[PDB]
Design a protein around this ligand. Structure first.
Ligand SMILES: *[C@@H]1O[C@H](CO)[C@@H](O)[C@H](O)[C@H]1NC(C)=O
Ligand SMILES: *[C@@H]1O[C@H](CO)[C@@H](O)[C@H](O)[C@H]1NC(C)=O
Lengths: 49, 48, 97, 48, 49
């Protein structure tokens, strides 16, 4: 949902108060990206164990 | 070269270790990207 | 572009290409000219730090009360018909009296 | 509603119920009348 | 959190740039619903396996 995926691009374009809105979208997406990975790894570990 | 620096090359801001690459870019090819789509390599706009 | 004497009408607007030059936007704040200056897509203060590839400035003249109706997604007798801006458009709003 | 001669005061405001009719809102774009026209809830062009 | 849960209602009311803000609320909630479903199904399958 953010304008760009690169953090250095958003920090170079939007205002510091404005960049925090779009960076909030990347982190929330990257958290779910990491949560989905960790969730599968915890489940795949039980398969391996 | 060969040192970690925070750089801006032709309006592209990045931080990484700059090394001479053996890859051959086409004349129009400038900004390279990896599997992660982050910038793999660039081209010096002053002296190409 | 900005200081030109008489702009083209909004009916038929001239497209002024800006390429192969050095654009310093701090001059805008140095001497007071533009009354209304707002950038939706980028930061007015970061315009000097980060630079853009192809700059195209579209000059025209519209009714005064329509300055609030000219923006991405906004509507009006101009925006809906004569001259429209993209909904994903990133740019700056430049206006003066 | 729009071009009524004299509206009621904001102290006691008139409630105008519009139903069982055909509303063409393109007339508002035809002639310039409204100084400030904006729709928060929906799109003004999607009203038709 | 969106004004309505119907896509055709949001697309027909708010602007395309305004609809993407509300559609972002639906998909984020629908991803969290689908990811939670897949999370359980992977865990329920581990019980079945
Ligand atoms: C300036 O730019 C040109 C073309 O990119 C390059 O050939 C030259 O070496 C650069 N330096 C000077 C001082 O001209
Ligand atoms: C426009 O150029 C004239 C003549 O150089 C100068 O006197 C004036 O200050 C300029 N105005 C703006 C808005 O830059």
């Amino acid at each position: 949902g953010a304008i760009s995926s690169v953090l250095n691009d958003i920090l170079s374009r939007l205002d510091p108060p404005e960049a925090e809105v779009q960076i909030d979208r990347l982190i929330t997406g990257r958290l779910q990206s990491l949560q989905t990975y960790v969730t599968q790894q915890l489940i795949r570990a039980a398969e391996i164990r | 070269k060969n040192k970690c620096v925070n750089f801006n090359f032709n309006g592209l801001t990045g931080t990484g270790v700059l090394t001479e690459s053996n890859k051959k870019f086409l004349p129009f090819q400038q900004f390279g990207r990896d599997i992660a789509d982050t910038t793999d390599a660039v081209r010096d706009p002053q002296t190409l | 572009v900005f200081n030109a004497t008489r702009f083209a009408s909004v009916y038929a607007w001239n497209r002024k290409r800006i390429s192969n030059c050095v654009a310093d936007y701090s001059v805008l704040y140095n001497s007071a000219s533009f009354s209304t200056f707002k950038c939706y897509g980028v930061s007015p203060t970061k315009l000097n730090d980060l630079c853009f590839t192809n700059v195209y400035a579209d000059s025209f003249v519209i009714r005064g009360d329509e300055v609030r109706q000219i923006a991405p997604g906004q509507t009006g007798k101009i925006a809906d018909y004569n001259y429209k801006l993209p909904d994903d458009f990133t740019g700056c709003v430049i206006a003066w009296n």
